[PDB]
Amino acid sequence: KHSLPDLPYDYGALEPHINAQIMQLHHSKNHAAYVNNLNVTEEKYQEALAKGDVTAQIALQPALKFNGGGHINHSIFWTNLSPNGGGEPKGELLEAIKRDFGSFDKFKEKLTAASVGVQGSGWGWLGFNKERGHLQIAACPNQDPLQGTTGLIPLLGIDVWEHAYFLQYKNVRPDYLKAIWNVINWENVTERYMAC
């Protein structure tokens, strides 16, 4: 069965950028539920597959994508952040970013635009296009995961579901986007990029 990963830092480690309450609820309630729901859903799919029940399989897709994606997305997200993060990546990811976006600030501007642009619940992503061999910005609705729905390998995700910022930033998603750069774990993003 899938499991809720531990946080590589405590709930208030990202203060004052993302407050303690947001982190605690996001991980212990939101992500926790996705995992449990995912396990239930995956087990039902095993029964349906074994029975050759195509209708049941299709009927289960929404739950599998939503909770499955919820697990995939947040799992990556936690590793994308750090109390000791911020700044700019060091090395090959930085050169890749300059190459594909002109500069690191233009890139930030682009990911910010995509993230703030999401109508409703969603995610902003910096991903890697293997078919083309370059970085690419993308946005996904609800919990639809980047790789499973677009083929892009996720490097850095920005959760723009209201639960990710409302307590502290209310409706001002732009301020949440501005603040988050201060806690991005570029070493993790770099490692994800190098794994490509």
Query: Rule CB under 5 A: which residues touch Mn ion?
Result: 159, 161, 164
Q: Where are the beta strands (DSSP E) in 143-195?
A: 153-159
In the complex, least distance from residue 143 CB atom to its own copies, rounded to whole angstroms: 7
Q: Is position 6 annotated in a ligand binding site?
A: no
Cα–Cα dist 72/44, whole Å = 19
* 159 marked ligand binding residue: yes
Cα–Cα distance, 31 to 163 (Å, whole number): 11
The closest of 74, 63, 85 to 26, measured between CA atoms, is 74
Q: Could you tell me the end-to-end alpha-carbon distance of the chain, in angstroms, rounded to an integer?
A: 27
Contact 184, 81 (CB under 8 A): yes
- Give the one entry of Mn ion, its own copies, none that residue 16 binds, where binding means its C-beta sits below a cut-off of 5 to 8 angstroms depending on kind: none
* Binding partner of 29, given Mn ion, its own copies, none, CB within 5-8 angstroms per partner class: its own copies
Q: Which is nearer to its own copies, 85 or 145 (CB)?
A: 145
Q: Is 17 within any annotated ligand binding site?
A: no
Nearer to its own copies, 84 or 149 (CB): 149
Closer CB to its own copies, 84 or 171, in the complex: 171
At 6 the three-state DSSP class reads: coil
| Least Å from the CB of residue 60 to its own copies | 9
Q: Which long-range contacts (CB under 8 A, 24 or more apart) does 88-91 make?
A: 88/186, 89/186, 89/187, 89/189, 89/190, 90/186, 90/190, 91/190
Phi, psi for 107 (deg, rounded to 5):
-60, -50
Report whether 74 belongs to an annotated binding site. Answer: yes
Binding residues (CB under 8 A) for its own copies: these are 2, 25, 29-30, 33, 38, 42, 45-46, 49, 52, 54-59, 61-62, 64-66, 68-69, 71-72, 119-122, 141-145, 147-149, 151, 161-163, 166-167, 170-171
Task: Report the candidate in 42, 37, 7, 41 with the shortest Cα–Cα distance to residue 25.
Answer: 7
For its own copies, the closer CB: 24 or 182: 24
Q: Nearest residue to Mn ion, using CB?
A: 159
Shortest Cβ 196–Mn ion spacing (Å): 24
Which residues make up each annotated binding site?
A: 26, 74, 159, 163
Which residues make up each annotated binding site for Mn(2+)?
A: 26, 74, 159, 163
